[PDB]
Amino acid sequence: PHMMDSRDWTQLGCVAYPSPIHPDYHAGPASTIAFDNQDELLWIGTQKGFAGSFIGRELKRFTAFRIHPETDGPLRQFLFVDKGVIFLGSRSVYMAARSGVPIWSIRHESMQDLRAMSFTSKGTSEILVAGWQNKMLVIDVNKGEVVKELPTQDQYSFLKMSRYICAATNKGTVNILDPITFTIKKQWQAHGAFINDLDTSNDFIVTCGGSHRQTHNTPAILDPYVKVFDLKNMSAMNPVPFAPLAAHVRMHPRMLTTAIVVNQAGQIHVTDLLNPSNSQVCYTQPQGVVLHFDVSRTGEGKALADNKHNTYVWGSPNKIQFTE
């Protein structure tokens, strides 16, 4: 295939978060990471709900604040809108400006163990919120309040809006939901037992996962494929091979049919989903096991968090831009 060149691929930045001095350090590594839509921010969460933002490729520390009571557990997910950042915990949803100025706070009784959120049919004005529970909630982002509760038989681990709401259950199944009614349009059996990551563009769903969930005596086993679904034609595609075992995946923002696939050793494949033999390979050599991954809006910045509490940014040594 092709091996990527070092003139286009180098470690641009690294930060320890939470670092040994941090109060949440004892609770573990980063719980989630996400590039902002603006201001060249990368956001990182802790296992106790601290949020930190970091500027540019060198990840200069910017803002930092806790978004829910420590006892609520890990920061679950970020979402970004013009006015600020939405913060998801298991028992609440918090919104504040990027500077940390509070905007609203929702602590609803049906918020018992939330795990994921996504936008819906109303742009950035409305989000859907779900988790390992039998209820989902719809929230007006503008007014900062719950608008409706929805029952659900399937519990969810990932949510993302593209053409529809792509909803990974906690059983390796993907439900595709109508963005307005939230009813299940189609169910896609992506992996055997669990989904480890999901992303989606208007044309594709891509997932990583495996056939054996982690147990008390056995470690989790990831599949040697990225699974692919056609949103346009609403039908599954042939699995894209990934020998290093696919742990995380992101659709490339500016290459329509291309996905960025990462294994736990930090090995990355940039692969055309329609032509798998065409794929660039590159390595990042993280200190620990990679747990989370994201790509910036421009596609120029790649971020990876490991279980040694490091978060790295990779990209071209030339001038880079997270958001354009």
Contacts with Cl ion by CB under 5 A lie at 18-19, 22
User: For residues 89 and 210, what is the distance between their CA atoms, to the nearest angstrom?
Assistant: 25
User: For residues 251 and 85, what is the distance between their CA atoms, to the nearest angstrom?
Assistant: 22
Cβ proximity to Cl ion, 19 vs 189, nearer residue:
19
313 and 297 in contact (C-beta within 8 Å)?
Answer: no
Cβ proximity to Cl ion, 51 vs 161, nearer residue:
51
Output Rg (C-alpha) for the chain, integer angstroms. Answer: 18
Neighbours of 60 (CB within 10 A): 12
Cβ proximity to Cl ion, 62 vs 164, nearer residue:
62
Cβ proximity to Cl ion, 54 vs 87, nearer residue:
54
CA 225 to each of CA 4, 159, 190, 213, 244: distance values in angstroms, whole numbers, following the listed order? 21, 21, 10, 16, 9
For the CB of residue 317, give the shortest distance to Cl ion in the complex, in Å.
27
For the CB of residue 28, give the shortest distance to Cl ion in the complex, in Å.
13
For the CB of residue 27, give the shortest distance to Cl ion in the complex, in Å.
12
Query: What burial class does residue 192 get, using C-beta atoms within 10 Å of its C-beta: 0-12 exposed, 13-18 middle, 19+ buried?
Result: middle
For the CB of residue 13, give the shortest distance to Cl ion in the complex, in Å.
15
For the CB of residue 52, give the shortest distance to Cl ion in the complex, in Å.
7
CA 192 to each of CA 20, 170, 269: distance values in angstroms, whole numbers, following the listed order? 38, 11, 23
Cβ proximity to Cl ion, 22 vs 83, nearer residue:
22
For the CB of residue 50, give the shortest distance to Cl ion in the complex, in Å.
9
User: For residues 114 and 229, what is the distance between their CA atoms, to the nearest angstrom?
Assistant: 26
Phi then psi dihedrals of residue 47, to 5 deg:
-75, 0
The encoded tokens of residue 224 equal: 């040697």
Cβ proximity to Cl ion, 19 vs 142, nearer residue:
19
The residue nearest Cl ion at its CB is: 19
Cβ proximity to Cl ion, 32 vs 201, nearer residue:
32
For the CB of residue 37, give the shortest distance to Cl ion in the complex, in Å.
24
List, as one string, the DSSP characters of 235-295: EE-PPEE-TT---EEEE-SSSTTEEEEE-TT--EEEEETT-TTSEEEE----SS-EEEEEE
